[PDB]
């Protein structure tokens, strides 16, 4: 299968490739936000929305990945090799998981249309040469 | 965050806590079943159903765990340690993925009410001692148990 | 041109590979079945279905392949590479031909919907563990 | 069997023997024509026409034959007879497939009636001795 996890939400992996990898917050920050804002709705027995249905699975996937990596590191011998596997998991898997978490949290919070427009505008920005690039990077806001 | 991936679908891990590991097809078998029965909808741009959404997410999670574990193994030269990590993954995360994929495929196929009734009855069965339960488990199928089509 | 010989019938190579390759009857058996059941319709100057229009072309393709393989084998000096070429043709192309002939004969005989349901059901069956499936395999039948 | 792949479409292998074997375009040219004109219908999931149902199978036959001949030539350790292999192919199977693709692309572009009338008229022409044969041979066209 060639599943794109954003195609049903109107985006694509080429649209989120606009944003760099240094843009997405830490997974701890994203999960703290998710808790604070939608704990009672993610722990709820209800299809409140596809964004919830997907954020739950993303949280569980992060849990499984962290469990595996922790077990590996503990059963591992060299601290260099431990930090090495940590770097690999962080970059690859953390990047993808926080792409997903960011997308879905931001959608729930602001709007799917707003998030797509934000990706487009951020692409405009990050493509603009720095001599004509405003320092006020785009940012999602409700106020 | 105390999330149950089935509570949203009317199930629980305590309801699937009975189904043994022997009950779930291999992950390759389940992914083939998906690719062959619902690919045109899993690769679709539509929210066909919560089951499709969860199935997409589960497939992504499995692919990611496979990348991780494969890289780990190929970097751990010792085949003993490689097979050890493989046992761990196939026992915990592979089992959870089989459980989830089975739940969702079986729901899409037969019905949520039907699958939950089947889980209740299978629990009644597997909780019962063998000396007092029928030997042939309860069966969920798209066919008469004679297995003939017309 | 990225053509699927089944998507005009509602199936797919991914769905017919969903079954094992040890399941499909031999090509001799399938051609005999055809000559027995639909010869006077395949040799007819009528379409009568898309299934016949496809089955005729499948049979002719098999004829051409057999002709070529036989000719190369006959003109090949050694008797050890004929086994290699016949194994290659059998597996690779004969498998596709078996799938196609089975699909079309079974469709004409039982029903397109029944054949597709049989595909999915037999796949799930052969993929399920034995202790939690019906014990005897599924089969297509016209006899109530 | 005695399947004639054209009598389902109103012709015969002896009504196309009116045209020589030099008359038929190359398979490359014919597949290019098909891609140009009926790609989105050959790739379609619809029984758009028996001509489509047959063109798809012809293209797949060509694919399988090419695969086989390529594999054979590769494993073969002499061009001296690799060329003879491909000669046999282009002489028998390539020719049959050229006839088939020509017939179907034409019956799709111009019409079955027009194509059969063209075959009859071209038989008249190519039978007429050269001393009495007009130079403006018949030809299939949408324009004068």
Swiss-Prot record, chain B:
GO cellular component labels: host cell; host cell cytoplasm; T=4 icosahedral viral capsid
Result of changing residue 80 to I: In strain: Latvia
Keywords, sorted A to Z: Capsid protein, Cytoplasmic inwards viral transport, DNA-binding, Host cytoplasm, Host-virus interaction, Microtubular inwards viral transport, Phosphoprotein, Repeat, RNA-binding, T=4 icosahedral capsid protein, Viral penetration into host nucleus, Virion, Virus entry into host cell
Gene Ontology terms: biological process: microtubule-dependent intracellular transport of viral material towards nucleus; symbiont entry into host cell; viral penetration into host nucleus
GO molecular function: DNA binding; RNA binding; structural molecule activity
Subunit architecture: Homodimerizes, then multimerizes. Interacts with cytosol exposed regions of viral L glycoprotein present in the reticulum-to-Golgi compartment. Interacts with human FLNB. Phosphorylated form interacts with host importin alpha; this interaction depends on the exposure of the NLS, which itself depends upon genome maturation and/or phosphorylation of the capsid protein. Interacts with host NUP153.
Function according to Swiss-Prot or TrEMBL: Self assembles to form an icosahedral capsid. Most capsids appear to be large particles with an icosahedral symmetry of T=4 and consist of 240 copies of capsid protein, though a fraction forms smaller T=3 particles consisting of 180 capsid proteins. Entering capsids are transported along microtubules to the nucleus. Phosphorylation of the capsid is thought to induce exposure of nuclear localization signal in the C-terminal portion of the capsid protein that allows binding to the nuclear pore complex via the importin (karyopherin-) alpha and beta.
Family: Belongs to the orthohepadnavirus core antigen family.
Name of the protein described by the UniProt record: Capsid protein
Organism: Hepatitis B virus genotype D subtype ayw (isolate France/Tiollais/1979)
Portion of the full-length sequence here: 1 to 150 of 183
